[PDB]
Design a protein around this ligand. Structure first.
Ligand SMILES: CNc1ncc2c(F)c(-c3c(C)ccc(C(=O)c4c(-c5ccccc5)n(C)n(-c5ccccc5)c4=O)c3N)ccc2n1
Length: 260
């Protein structure tokens, strides 16, 4: 048996694992570029397999500055079936890591945080404009290109339900509005640095229930209102992504070092 993966690529390292998958960094021999390659073991469940095959076809159609860049997908059946998915390689440190390395207010300057958030919201608006949704938006699914461009995807590098809409937690039917709820908590978290995991969990749990730290409401009155709206228990009451991105807070964002 000839393995397409082993023939075409030089493996570099394991980047991680999660769900049906394992992810490698590998260099393509012909083009000399390094990629992230996800190897998904197809499940022994026909309905789950149906979903996997649909999802790869869907992701292959997507092109947007804030969405992970697709290259190829293929199947291998060594004498178990594996689906390989080849994407652009992002930096090792994702948004969760980035926030964990910036634990002071000085390291979360408003314009920087809003610039990062805007890119996430724009990726979400793109999905919604295509009649798609993310469903699992959270900092561990938000990475950066080598040049710090925000990239949204379904990464599956398990190292949480904190960002999940109430309707999803309860196992109810849902709409694209689930992503708006996730966005609300992410906006808050970007603006509000933590010193401990315990502090993070307690505060984000309170924020889910619209209980905000007084110093956040005072420092960021505009974003406070935005987060409140995004975290409405009623999905109908949450704003569309397009209305979030058109908010006045996102106008003429600048910071020293910003790409010009
Ligand atoms: C440390 N650096 C680094 N860099 C890039 C990575 C990467 F692109 C991925 C990655 C890979 C290799 C493949 C697909 C994705 C991805 O976003 C996926 C996506 C996806 C979801 C939303 C937008 C775009 C893509 N889907 C739908 N799926 C998927 C889900 C269920 C079944 C089958 C496929 C994905 O796997 C991905 N993020 C994983 C880890 C990475 N690590």
């Amino acid at each position: 048996y000839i393995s397409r993966y082993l023939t075409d690529f030089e493996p570099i390292q394991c980047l991680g694992r999660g769900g049906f998958g394992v992810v490698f960094e590998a260099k393509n021999k012909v083009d000399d570029c390094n990629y992230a390659i996800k190897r998904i073991r197809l499940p022994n469940r026909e309905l789950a397999r149906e979903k996997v095959m649909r999802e790869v076809k869907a992701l292959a159609k997507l092109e947007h500055p804030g969405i992970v860049r697709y290259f190829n997908a293929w199947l291998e059946a060594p004498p178990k079936v594996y689906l390989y998915i080849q994407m652009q390689l992002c930096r090792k440190e994702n948004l969760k890591d980035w926030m964990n390395g910036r634990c002071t207010i000085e390291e979360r300057e408003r314009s920087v945080c809003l610039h990062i958030f805007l890119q996430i919201a724009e990726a979400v608006e793109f999905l919604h404009s295509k009649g798609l949704m993310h469903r699992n938006l959270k900092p561990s699914n938000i990475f950066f290109t080598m040049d710090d461009v925000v990239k949204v995807g379904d990464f599956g590098l398990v190292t949480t339900k904190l960002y999940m809409s109430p309707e999803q937690i309860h196992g109810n039917s849902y709409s694209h509005k689930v992503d708006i709820f996730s966005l609300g908590l992410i906006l808050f978290e970007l603006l509000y640095p933590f010193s401990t995991q315990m502090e993070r969990v307690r505060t984000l749990t309170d924020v889910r229930n619209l209980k905000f730290p007084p110093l956040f409401t005072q420092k960021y009155p505009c974003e406070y209102v935005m987060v409140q709206d995004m975290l409405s228990p009623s999905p109908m009451e949450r704003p569309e992504a397009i209305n979030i991105i058109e908010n006045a807070v996102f106008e003429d964002l600048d910071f020293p070092g910003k790409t010009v």
